[PDB]
Design a binder for this molecule. Sequence first.
Ligand SMILES: Nc1ncnc2c1ncn2[C@@H]1O[C@H](COP(=O)(O)OP(=O)(O)OP(=O)(O)O)[C@@H](O)[C@H]1O
Lengths: 353, 146, 69
Amino acid sequence: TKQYEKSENDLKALQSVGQIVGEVLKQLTEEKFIVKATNGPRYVVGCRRQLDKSKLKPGTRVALDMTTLTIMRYLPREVDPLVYNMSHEDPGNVSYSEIGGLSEQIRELREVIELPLTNPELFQRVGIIPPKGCLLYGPPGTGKTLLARAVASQLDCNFLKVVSSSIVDKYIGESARLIREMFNYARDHQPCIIFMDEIDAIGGRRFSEGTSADREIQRTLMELLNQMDGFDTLHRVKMIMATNRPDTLDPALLRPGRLDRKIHIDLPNEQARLDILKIHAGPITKHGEIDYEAIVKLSDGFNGADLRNVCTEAGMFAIRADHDFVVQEDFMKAVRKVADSKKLESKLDYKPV
Amino acid sequence: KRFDSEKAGDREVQRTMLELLNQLDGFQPNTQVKVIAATNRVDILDPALLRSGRLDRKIEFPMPNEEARARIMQIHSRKMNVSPDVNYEELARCTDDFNGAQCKAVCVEAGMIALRRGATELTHEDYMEGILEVQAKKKANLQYYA
Amino acid sequence: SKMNLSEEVDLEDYVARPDKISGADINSICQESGMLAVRENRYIVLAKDFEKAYKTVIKKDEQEHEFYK
Ligand SMILES: Nc1ncnc2c1ncn2[C@@H]1O[C@H](COP(=O)(O)OP(=O)(O)OP(=O)(O)O)[C@@H](O)[C@H]1O
């Protein structure tokens, strides 16, 4: 029962008041150390006898006391968006080769990513600069989020994710230090891979500057433009971006450097649609008599999200008939009808609104 | 999303709606708690909305049928006390292209006919009254012209 | 001058046919020609890999002699 006495004595040590944290700036002398608290005041204070030479550091966060503001222990500094960035997930592996097309985009994205990791020798011996970035835009077909994130999730602890909602951040919020942090940790984990999706809102041009909120978009831009075209070495880390249209990217992003390789997604083709139907027919049960050319021919110019989810819509029409294994006749009904209904809903392609 | 930028006043939400498409893309738990959406017009529609997680069933509701406009307005008028001898034949055919809200405009109008009102509705002309109120009535026709 | 030569790639044609489609083809667009050299898969980048980046662009037309026309 002495564990209670042990537990309460540990809570007696909890009577010790907590301290405050700050960032070291410089040092005037041994008895005065410039430290900037997270609030922004800067103090020059002494120190106690329990610390070492590793406490000083070149501008690293420290914990200031609440009385004399002296430093107790030092800890590594992070603003910690990254743990939130690593909270993503995705199956595959397999989903790499499941899309089926285009075969040239399947093989190339495997090279520019994996080859610099395993074989740097080809770059240094031939004397060529490997691509440090890439651009995958849409939606002329699917595979943007599927193929890129598959290698991401398979690369495990080495990856960086960016959602377009985190750039605006909060009122009078600072995303300029996020752009510098995103590329700072990109230079830590190697090779790092960064995904930026739906940049049309956060890629704001400075031609027409609305209200007070367009400039803070330009600030996040110029922070991206500086480090991607640096002057700061990104050669080992790979970057990826995504957008609906490259209208607002400006000559800065449309240029090479910051955006290196722009690979346009291609819609599924009758030859390639035969492969994507094989992977769709796996999870769904079918009748013993099935023809893959029937579904491929009846559905043309449809994205992979259209084909899959309508093939599940065919299963929802199949459960309307309660049959477990269903012939493709009931499928071709639900596949053609529901898909042709989707075509009269959204205008594009080809006509803009 | 319009065409050019910047900027739209709701652009913060038009990015969040596309973030919802990202939540329906990369986040598997978003397959739970189905969300229902409704719009007034499809004039502006995002092509990226196609998915099971994203907009899947999209229904075009046209102007209700003449028999449909009579059924929806009868369910609304079942509570009120109406004068007898309602054939339902003329009121259904007199309803053409009219929206369901304009049908309740006649239903809400049909609830005022009890007391006086004081204008004399009598009977069987009640439905065709507020039916013409929005798009009719001449007047002209001819005058000042041929 | 930076690439090892060991040429294996024609330095003649690049001053003729791509020179007509040059401009632009500005600056780091030539780095993409070097960034398209990772397509190989070969001991030395093929002559078509540099030209593939120079032909696309994804620009013009057509144009010049057709404008005269
Ligand atoms: N060929 C496919 N096979 C399996 N699933 C697919 C396929 N294409 C799309 N999907 C599903 O659709 C979702 C979105 O994929 P992706 O980002 O590649 O297309 P998208 O950009 O959403 O297309 P759109 O913009 O036309 O909706 C993914 O979560 C994926 O599960």
